[PDB]
Design an enzyme around this catalytic site. Structure first.
Site, PDB file in Angstrom:
ATOM      1  N   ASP A  39     -29.146 103.046 -36.516  1.00 37.61           N
ATOM      2  CA  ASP A  39     -28.972 103.580 -38.319  1.00 37.61           C
ATOM      3  C   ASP A  39     -27.801 104.343 -38.406  1.00 37.61           C
ATOM      4  O   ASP A  39     -26.393 103.802 -37.631  1.00 37.61           O
ATOM      5  CB  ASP A  39     -30.128 103.703 -37.477  1.00 37.61           C
ATOM      6  CG  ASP A  39     -30.210 104.135 -39.681  1.00 37.61           C
ATOM      7  OD1 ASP A  39     -29.504 104.768 -40.862  1.00 37.61           O
ATOM      8  OD2 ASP A  39     -31.923 103.868 -40.154  1.00 37.61           O
ATOM      9  N   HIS A  69     -29.844 109.741 -42.487  1.00 45.74           N
ATOM     10  CA  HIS A  69     -30.659 108.258 -43.623  1.00 45.74           C
ATOM     11  C   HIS A  69     -31.704 108.095 -41.718  1.00 45.74           C
ATOM     12  O   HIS A  69     -32.429 107.716 -40.999  1.00 45.74           O
ATOM     13  CB  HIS A  69     -30.106 107.035 -44.082  1.00 45.74           C
ATOM     14  CG  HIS A  69     -30.526 105.797 -43.194  1.00 45.74           C
ATOM     15  ND1 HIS A  69     -31.622 105.425 -44.447  1.00 45.74           N
ATOM     16  CD2 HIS A  69     -30.557 104.279 -42.374  1.00 45.74           C
ATOM     17  CE1 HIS A  69     -32.069 104.037 -44.082  1.00 45.74           C
ATOM     18  NE2 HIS A  69     -31.219 104.135 -42.829  1.00 45.74           N
ATOM     19  N   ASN A 161     -34.424  96.513 -50.065  1.00 42.86           N
ATOM     20  CA  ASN A 161     -34.612  96.799 -51.400  1.00 42.86           C
ATOM     21  C   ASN A 161     -34.136  96.311 -52.468  1.00 42.86           C
ATOM     22  O   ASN A 161     -34.606  96.679 -53.324  1.00 42.86           O
ATOM     23  CB  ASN A 161     -34.196  97.927 -51.155  1.00 42.86           C
ATOM     24  CG  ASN A 161     -34.810  99.301 -49.449  1.00 42.86           C
ATOM     25  OD1 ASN A 161     -35.718  98.496 -49.219  1.00 42.86           O
ATOM     26  ND2 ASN A 161     -33.739  99.675 -49.630  1.00 42.86           N
ATOM     27  N   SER A 224     -36.837 100.988 -45.082  1.00 38.76           N
ATOM     28  CA  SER A 224     -36.077 101.296 -43.897  1.00 38.76           C
ATOM     29  C   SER A 224     -37.089 102.711 -43.410  1.00 38.76           C
ATOM     30  O   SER A 224     -36.573 103.235 -42.650  1.00 38.76           O
ATOM     31  CB  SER A 224     -35.015 102.518 -43.880  1.00 38.76           C
ATOM     32  OG  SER A 224     -34.615 102.840 -43.263  1.00 38.76           O
TER      33      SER A 224
END
Ligand SMILES: [Ca+2]
Length: 279
Positions: A39, A69, A161, A224
Site C-alpha cells: 500500500d 491509507h 470501488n 480496501s
C-alpha cells in the site's frame, strides 16, 4: 477474548448477526503469523501497533506513509484496538506514493518482493498479504498476484470501488487469489463495491474506524477496508491451525455467514467473513 465497544466491522466478523458491538476472538490473536500490507506504507511508530509493525520495502524516496491509507489498512489487520489479528507481525511494502498512486511495474515488483521476503521473516504460523489496490485489467498484474499466492502467501485483494464487475480489474480478477467485496453495518453490499463471479468473499467496508498517520484515527470506506478484515482473519485462522495459506480463502468462504447480505447481484457470492469463534 472479548473486546467491548469494538469497531462495528470487528464485531461483525465474530457475529452470526449484525447490530452488535463486541469483538470475540481466540486470545492467540494471530501470534506467530505475519501480514504484509502492500500500500502507501505504515506509520510503524503508531502506539496502536505496539512495536509489531515494520516497514520492509519502499520504491520511493521515503518508506514513511505520507498518505494514511496503508496505515489504516494495517490497523484493521492488526492494531490493538482496530485490528482483527491483534498479535500478528505487520510488514509494510510501499508500492503506492503519497497520493495513493503506483505504476503497475512497481506494484508487480512489490508482490514479487513479498514472495521472496517472507523467507527472511519469522512467521511459523503462516504468511498473508493484504493488497488494497487496483486498476484496470492487466494479465501481468494478475500473474504477479498468482505467483505471490503460489509461493505460499494467502493473498487478499480489494474487489474495487467502481460498482462494476470485478472481472475488468486487476488483481481483483485473478482466480487464484481471494477477492474481497465490501459490506455495510446493516449487511447491505456497500454502494461502491464491485461484484461479479470473481469475488470470493465480503468483509466490512463502509465507515471503518482504524489508525491514521500522525498517531491519529479515522473512519473511511472502501473494498480496501474490507480486504484487511479478511487478511487479518486469515492470519488469525492460520495461527489457530484451522487452515493454511493455500486454502484459507476457501476455508473462509466455506465457514462464512451465508445468504445474509442484501443488494448482492445475481451470480455474485453472498458470503460474509466470519471467525466462528465460540467464546
Ligand atoms: Ca480461488
Amino acid at each position: 477474548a472479548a473486546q467491548t465497544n469494538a469497531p462495528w466491522g470487528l464485531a461483525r466478523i465474530s457475529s452470526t448477526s449484525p447490530g452488535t458491538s463486541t469483538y470475540y476472538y481466540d486470545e492467540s490473536a494471530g501470534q506467530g503469523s505475519c501480514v504484509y500490507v502492500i500500500d502507501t506504507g505504515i506509520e510503524a511508530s503508531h502506539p496502536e501497533f505496539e512495536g509489531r509493525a515494520q516497514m520492509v520495502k519502499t520504491y520511493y524516496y521515503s518508506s514513511r506513509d505520507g498518505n494514511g491509507h496503508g496505515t489504516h489498512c494495517a490497523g484493521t489487520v492488526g492494531s490493538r484496538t482496530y485490528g482483527v489479528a491483534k498479535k500478528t507481525q505487520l510488514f509494510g511494502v510501499k508500492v503506492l506514493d503519497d497520493n495513493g498512486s503506483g505504476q503497475y511495474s512497481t506494484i508487480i515488483a512489490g508482490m514479487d518482493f513479498v514472495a521472496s521476503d517472507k523467507n527472511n521473516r519469522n512467521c511459523p504460523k503462516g504468511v498473508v498479504a493484504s493488497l488494497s489496490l487496483g486498476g484496470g485489467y492487466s494479465s501481468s498484474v494478475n500473474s504477479a498476484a498468482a505467483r505471490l499466492q503460489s509461493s505460499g502467501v494467502m493473498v487478499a485483494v480489494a474487489a474495487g470501488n467502481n460498482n462494476a464487475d470485478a472481472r475488468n480489474y486487476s488483481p481483483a480478477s485473478e482466480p487464484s487469489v481471494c477477492t474481497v467485496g465490501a459490506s455495510d453495518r446493516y449487511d447491505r453490499r456497500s454502494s461502491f463495491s464491485n461484484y461479479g463471479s470473481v469475488l470470493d468473499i465480503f468483509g466490512p467496508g463502509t465507515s471503518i474506524l482504524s489508525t491514521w498517520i500522525g498517531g491519529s484515527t479515522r473512519s473511511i470506506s472502501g473494498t480496501s477496508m474490507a480486504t484487511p478484515h479478511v487478511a487479518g482473519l486469515a492470519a488469525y485462522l492460520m495461527t489457530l491451525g484451522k487452515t493454511t495459506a493455500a486454502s484459507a480463502c476457501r476455508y473462509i468462504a466455506d465457514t462464512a455467514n451465508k445468504g445474509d447480505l442484501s443488494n448482492i447481484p445475481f451470480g455474485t457470492v453472498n458470503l460474509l467473513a466470519y471467525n466462528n469463534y465460540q467464546a
